[PDB]
RNA sequence: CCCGGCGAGGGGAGUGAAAAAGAACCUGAAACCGUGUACGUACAAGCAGUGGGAGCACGCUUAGGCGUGUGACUGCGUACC
RNA sequence: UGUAACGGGGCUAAACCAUGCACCGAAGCUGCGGCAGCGACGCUUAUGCGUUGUUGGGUAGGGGAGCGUUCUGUAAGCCUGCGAAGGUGUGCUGUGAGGCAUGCUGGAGGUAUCAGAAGUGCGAAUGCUGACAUAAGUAACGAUAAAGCGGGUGAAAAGCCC
């Protein structure tokens, strides 16, 4: 290890560069309650594709 | 408009904070809500809940007007840092540093 | 210092600087290499000298003509009232009193007054003739100094 | 006052060709790189590059001076092992021919971004033929 | 009267200072005396 | 008596960072590096106000001797008849024509051939 | 009063000369950390600067320049004690 | 380890010998301007000068002249709540350490001048104290006996209750 010298604080705001999120940048809207969510996932109320489930 | 928010002596740190920060800058309201949902860190839920006191913040305080509405200001500047203790082999201690990150939001029209 | 003659940690085997006291300077609380002990700054003066200066300034302050005497210099009762109204009949403010003999009756009321000193032949220093902007003597009181110098 | 510099907007270039047949190697590219340097003209900037463009043609036609045909050599290393590789005069003009005017003008010129630049301006030929036709090329001999 | 709660983080300070500075000096040659049989070997008395 | 320094050690260091102002990274903060560059700057500058006259020389040469042989001559044969002809011109103002002026420069060169012949 | 978990923290209102006096509470510097804007940077090798030196963007002005910021390219140059 | 025993290009002269005329090129010399030290000069006459020349790299070191912080007397004086000190910038200025005015803050002290006494001027000393960067959101979350599911609580449940 042993680092000789220490580096910038330029360099590891490089070394962060690729280290950034990347969003979703994409939703839906569900074929009747029209709520937001994300593909195949189901809805808070639990509507997927229109189908009610779970009742919960 | 202004209207304003912050959250001050948050437990986490403004590096972790700060990558949110950046998915949403100059963006319409809405759709950082429905970003921050689903999106998942420890921060989402936090930040989340102060964007969503800054508009409350603003109807009542001020003119309203959420449907033409963007975030302008958003950035993290750290906080104090809490001294602990995790010891280690041989005998020697170690200081840890606990860290925390103050928020500010700046929610406008434009 | 209070302290412990220990040496605050090991010789050697460490990465910190060879250490034998915490009382030294180079630490807190604690210190002072050179440390200052009452010691008396008085100087001597060769006497004539001491007497050959009082002959100067005030052959000095003929030629300012600052300088004044009088006859027999006195309040009848010790009222700053009076005395000051004494003065301010000689356009005076900062002065300097001396007399070869002092009146009780008088020095009280020159006490209060911050721009007043009262003084007796044997009391006078240099400095304190230097100070007020006017100075008066007695004729009188003129004799003991001449005298005294001779 | 403040002498006078060039500035690249206000720079004129120009184009020039030569027939290298029966030239003389070193001698020649001499001139090759005063002219792209800009030392021959009165407004030379040392940190403009004021050259004119230049066209060599005929390259392989180019001779030189007693047995360097077959002694001169080439070296350049690949950065791998310690190898290294060297090619005869002769054998570069059976090959790559336009390298060798394309080199010996390199080592007579600075080193950096500006020297790349200038080199930027040469084009050579091994044939008699170019299609730059169209920016001119007025004549130029030496 | 409305004060912040109380903030230790002085103890694990002075418990920091004390802890370090007891092994690290008190310690002595543990790294080293370890490093003893590594110090029969690295030196090369000749 | 005792005295404090919290304060003119400041002004120091302020005033060394504002001369370090515009270089790179812990050369334009930190004083302890600051101090060893300025310094250090200075004896170039003492070093340069010397050497530009040089270059500038360098350059005016190199100007001229190109419209010279523009003139078919060379810079040295050039001078040397000048100094035959009696000519103390400077080698800045010279050069500053061969750039605006080419007239004067061009009717000038024959003066050195003619007294040079 | 509102957000907020009948939290924290915060924003309003209000007091107060002043909340740039809010409890961590006079002043509030530097290292350190960030947001914002002008310029430059993805063919360009090395104490990182200096000397020169375009172009760019500004504030002045005068009307032609003067200044500030950056700094493309180039000569030279291997820190301190 | 890689052209590698011209600096490289490249050079049959752009090599060697002889002869000659130019030219380039140092902080050297000269030119313009400026500062300071030294000596004689006759005035001056602790001084203008006139000059006249000459000197002015510099470690250990020796000598000389100085800047600026605190405190004291000068000062029951001066400036100051129509804003000190301190902080933060700009413009000027001096041969130099430095000096002056002012823009924003801050909210009450500072001190001319001339002498005096100094706990008196920092980059270091594996220096002391405290604060903050780094490597870095990397290693690691402490025995491999082991968890899975449904209900409840609640803002939220894998770790809480049944």
């Known amino acids: 290890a042993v680092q000789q010298n220490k580096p910038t604080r ?16 994409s939703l839906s809207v569900d074929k009747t309650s029209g ?15 229109g189908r009610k489930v779970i009742a919960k | ?16 904070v700060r990558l949110v920060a950046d998915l949403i800058r100059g963006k319409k309201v809405s759709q950082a809500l429905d970003i921050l949902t689903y999106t998942n860190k420890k921060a989402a839920v936090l930040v989340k809940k102060v964007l969503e006191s800054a508009i409350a913040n603003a109807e009542h305080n001020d003119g309203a007007d959420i449907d033409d509405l963007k975030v302008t200001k958003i950035f993290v500047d750290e906080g104090p840092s809490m001294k602990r203790i995790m ?19 700046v929610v406008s029209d434009r | 210092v209070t302290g412990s003659g220990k040496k605050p940690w090991r010789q050697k085997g460490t990465g910190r600087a060879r250490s034998g006291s915490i009382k030294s300077p180079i630490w807190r609380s604690g210190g002072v290499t050179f440390a200052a002990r009452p010691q008396d700054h008085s100087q001597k003066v060769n006497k004539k000298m001491y007497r050959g200066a009082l002959k100067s300034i005030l052959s000095e302050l003929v030629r300012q003509d600052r300088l004044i005497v009088v ?30 003999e002092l009146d009780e009756n008088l020095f009280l009321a020159a006490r209060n007054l911050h721009k007043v ?34 | 006052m403040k002498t006078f510099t060039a500035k690249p907007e206000t720079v004129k270039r120009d184009w020039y060709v030569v027939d290298a047949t029966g030239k003389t190697l070193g001698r020649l590219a001499t001139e090759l790189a005063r002219r792209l340097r800009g030392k021959h003209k009165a407004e030379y900037t040392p940190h403009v590059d004021t050259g004119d463009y230049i066209i060599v043609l005929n390259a392989d ?38 390298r060798v005017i394309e080199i010996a003008v390199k080592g007579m010129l600075p080193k950096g971004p500006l020297g790349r630049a200038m080199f930027r301006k040469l084009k050579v030929y091994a044939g008699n033929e170019h299609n730059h036709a ?5 004549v130029l001999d030496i | 009267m409305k004060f912040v709660k109380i903030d230790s983080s002085s103890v694990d300070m002075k418990k920091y200072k004390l802890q370090n500075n007891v092994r690290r000096s008190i310690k002595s040659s543990s790294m080293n005396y370890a490093n003893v049989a590594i110090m029969t070997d690295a030196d090369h008395d000749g | 008596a005792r005295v404090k320094r919290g304060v003119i050690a400041r002004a120091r260091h302020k005033k060394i960072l504002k001369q370090a102002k515009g270089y790179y990274g812990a050369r334009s903060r930190v004083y302890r590096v600051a101090f060893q560059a300025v310094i250090k700057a200075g004896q170039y500058a003492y070093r340069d106000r010397r050497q530009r006259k040089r270059q500038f020389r360098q350059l005016w040469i190199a100007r001229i001797n190109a419209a010279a042989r523009q003139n078919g001559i060379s810079y040295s044969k050039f001078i040397n008849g000048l100094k035959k002809a009696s000519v103390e011109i400077d080698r800045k103002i010279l050069a500053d024509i061969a750039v605006f002026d080419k007239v004067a420069f061009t009717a000038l060169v024959e003066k050195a051939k003619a007294a040079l012949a």
């Open chain 3, 71 to 100: 006859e027999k210099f006195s309040v009848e009762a010790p009222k700053t009232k009076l005395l000051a109204q004494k003065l301010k009949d000689m356009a005076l403010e900062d002065v300097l009193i001396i007399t070869g």
């Open chain 2, 87 to 105: 010891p280690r082999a041989k005998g020697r201690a170690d200081r840890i540093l606990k860290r925390t990150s103050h928020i500010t939001v």
């Open chain 1, 10 to 25: 330029s360099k590891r705001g490089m070394r962060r560069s690729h280290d950034a999120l990347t969003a979703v940048t």
């Open chain 4, 134 to 138: 169209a920016q001119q090329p007025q």
């Open chain 4, 61 to 98: 036609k180019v001779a030189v001076t007693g047995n360097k045909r077959t002694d001169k050599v080439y070296y350049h290393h690949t950065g791998h092992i310690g190898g290294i590789k060297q090619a005869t005069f002769e054998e570069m003009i059976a090959r790559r021919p336009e």
């Open chain 1, 35 to 49: 709520e937001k969510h994300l593909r195949h996932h189901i809805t808070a109320d639990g509507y997927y594709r």
């Open chain 3, 117 to 150: 000193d009262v003084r007796d032949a044997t009391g006078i220093d240099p400095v304190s003739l230097i100070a007020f902007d006017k100075v008066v003597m007695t004729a009188d009181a003129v004799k003991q100094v001449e005298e005294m110098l001779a």
């Open chain 2, 1 to 16: 408009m202004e209207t304003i928010a912050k959250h001050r002596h948050a437990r986490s740190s403004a590096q972790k």
